[PDB]
Amino acid sequence: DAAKLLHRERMERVTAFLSYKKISPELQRRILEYFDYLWETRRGYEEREVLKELPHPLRLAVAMEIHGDVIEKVPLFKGAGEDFIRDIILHLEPVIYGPGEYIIRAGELGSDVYFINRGSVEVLSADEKTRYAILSEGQFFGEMALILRAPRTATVRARTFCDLYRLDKETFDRILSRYPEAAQIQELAVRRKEELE
Amino acid sequence: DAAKLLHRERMERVTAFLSYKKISPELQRRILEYFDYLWETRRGYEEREVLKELPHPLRLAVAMEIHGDVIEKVPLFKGAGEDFIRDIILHLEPVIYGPGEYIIRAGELGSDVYFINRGSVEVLSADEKTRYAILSEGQFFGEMALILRAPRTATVRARTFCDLYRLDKETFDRILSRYPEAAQIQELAVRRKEELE
Amino acid sequence: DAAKLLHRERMERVTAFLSYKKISPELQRRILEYFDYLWETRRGYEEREVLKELPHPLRLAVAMEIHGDVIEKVPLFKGAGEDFIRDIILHLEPVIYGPGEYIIRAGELGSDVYFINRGSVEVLSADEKTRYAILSEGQFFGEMALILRAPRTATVRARTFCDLYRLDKETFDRILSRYPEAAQIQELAVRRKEELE
Amino acid sequence: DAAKLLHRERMERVTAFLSYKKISPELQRRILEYFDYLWETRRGYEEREVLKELPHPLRLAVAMEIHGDVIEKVPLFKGAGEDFIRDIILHLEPVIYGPGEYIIRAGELGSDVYFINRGSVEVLSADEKTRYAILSEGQFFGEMALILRAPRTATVRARTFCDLYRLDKETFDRILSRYPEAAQIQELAVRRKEELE
Ligand SMILES: Nc1ncnc2c1ncn2[C@@H]1O[C@@H]2COP(=O)(O)O[C@H]2[C@H]1O
Ligand SMILES: Nc1ncnc2c1ncn2[C@@H]1O[C@@H]2COP(=O)(O)O[C@H]2[C@H]1O
Ligand SMILES: Nc1ncnc2c1ncn2[C@@H]1O[C@@H]2COP(=O)(O)O[C@H]2[C@H]1O
Ligand SMILES: Nc1ncnc2c1ncn2[C@@H]1O[C@@H]2COP(=O)(O)O[C@H]2[C@H]1O
């Protein structure tokens, strides 16, 4: 288990540096709990570095197996066929957020869409006084900024540690075009736009 | 033979990770047979990394010797002279496909052209019910999308393990311009377009 | 303290090379004093490399703590709120200059703005006969080239070793737009433009 | 002298690979003599890697000292002042050619200009039947393609091992603009254009 050692090693570097920079213990704690969640959910492997010298059609086969969980637990990504999956599975970037961390701020102009695989997030207004929803596994958000061609309509914060998949606006728009049910999503963006005014 | 050890080492990393990600044995097997074909055809060397700090005119001399096999076994790349070779030999990127793997899908908009050095590939239709050809060493494909200014006219799958050379659309168009026999290829793209309708 | 060893190691490489290239002792001395200031002010850590695999919202939290000193000692960056900080704190690049080194030359077309955290700099004319100011901790310069849409109005040299933060023109213009007090700065650029003619 | 060992090490990798790829002994020999010239002229240091983490104004001071030889031995780069040097010294990229190697081919569209620091080169016509000149230390070539806004007017081959400095077209055009004597060069491009027809 030099992995576990390497893991605890490749964080004391950060830890030593941050101790030297005299950061607060609250922040320091957030760093540690991240690295713990990082270890327990990924076991020291780095999907990028380990799969880099793989040919594209193998990178594609691995992705459909190891990142299939997202695709099976999104209840409108069935009847979609393996062609739709094919164009999307390599453009799902896994990102990790911690509890309290902002993923989207309302007014922003991003168009990236996030698919939740683990954890739960808050959908809030600008003043953060209103909680429009709680989204979790098999759900997604950040889809409205493109369908409605509008800025981000709401703020999204993490409640827990979240395993998310980020989809770039470019891949997103290409999907809607080439794969119209792109309208059950649009029929979801609307009902959210409705319950927002 | 730390090379052979390094080789078997720089794959157990992938193997351990994929075992942990709980991939299927069929996929796992495809990974292993790739790395075996990779070892036997390349012996652990990485042409990119080993030749990187070489000056351009040496990179050019090595390429004509070690990637000459392609150029000698393509029976319309003779009478082409060493000037035509010169502008093409560094833009032939070696890629590896496995049996069953799609290289080109019909309808796609790529313009990259592939030259076969080893193995054999299938030329299929969209429904894959029709097999227009079997191409192997000294043959090439993906040339029609540019000459005809059309999308990919057919699907190309590997039958075996294939050593291919990818040529970018940019280098391809520049070649046709500056080196017209660019027409025996065009007279090949036509006869294929004919036997396709 | 292999750090201190590594540090003294990762400079003898430069030192050996420069000794071999037969550089002057004055220059050689400037190299050594830089590496000393580099060690004493940073203790061998490399903020880029150590924080690279951190998620964005953590990179953001660390930055506000460890690069907060700049933001607290700039007496017009209060009442600015944590939203203004948020969009700026990751676009402050720390750079080091040595005594005598030119940071800005008049006539140049850069728009980057520099915020001083440590040390002192000279504001000079083209002929360098005139010293318009001495700027130090909590002050900044290079702001006039954008507000006035003019080339650099003056030459800026370091008097001492300076810890500066560079802000790109792109982030700078975005700040002025979205955060108008952008006018107490403009009311500072003017009074400098006045006392310059 | 692990340097000399590292040097002989970081070439047997190339040597082993090329032996395995079954290259010709003539080519193999050209590789060895390059690496020898590389060792004797650079002693295993890599100016890029060794100076990378240096601040710009130090990279600038070192360059004027270690790459000053070029600037002092070009007899029309005096009376040029340290401002002209300043904008050029970091845009001189050192490249190495071997005897027989083409640096420029006539008809080509490059605009890069080469300054000779060591060795000698041939200026030839397309048919290579004519030798317009022999250029060596303190001389330069490739300047006519930009001044005359024409393609390369002649072929340039190395006679010996040459230490050259490459200047990009972008830096070149900027120099001519901001530093007109840009005309003693133009008065050199003309006399060459004359003695060429
Ligand atoms: N009523 C709602 N219920 C659930 N999610 C919502 C609601 N309103 C907005 N959102 C999500 O909040 C997101 C903020 O960014 P977008 O506008 O790109 O996309 C928005 C939706 O994904
Ligand atoms: N009848 C055919 N015989 C052989 N190869 C073919 C035939 N039809 C199409 N192809 C190849 O299939 C390729 C699919 O992509 P392209 O259109 O770029 O180029 C096409 C040809 O190279
Ligand atoms: N009178 C002055 N007092 C202080 N700083 C000055 C004065 N004049 C010019 N400067 C600084 O010199 C800088 C040179 O570059 P800029 O024009 O971008 O911005 C200018 C100001 O920051
Ligand atoms: N008569 C000549 N004497 C010396 N150098 C020459 C002569 N003719 C051409 N050259 C060099 O050959 C070069 C080929 O490329 P360029 O046109 O950019 O610039 C040209 C000159 O530098």
UniProtKB/TrEMBL annotation, chains A, B, C, D:
Residues 76-192 form the Cyclic nucleotide-binding domain. 3',5'-cyclic AMP binds at residues 142-145, 152-153, 195. 3',5'-cyclic GMP binds at residues 142-144, 152-153, 192. It is found in: Membrane. This is Cyclic nucleotide-binding domain-containing protein. The chain holds residues 226 to 423 of 430 of the full protein.
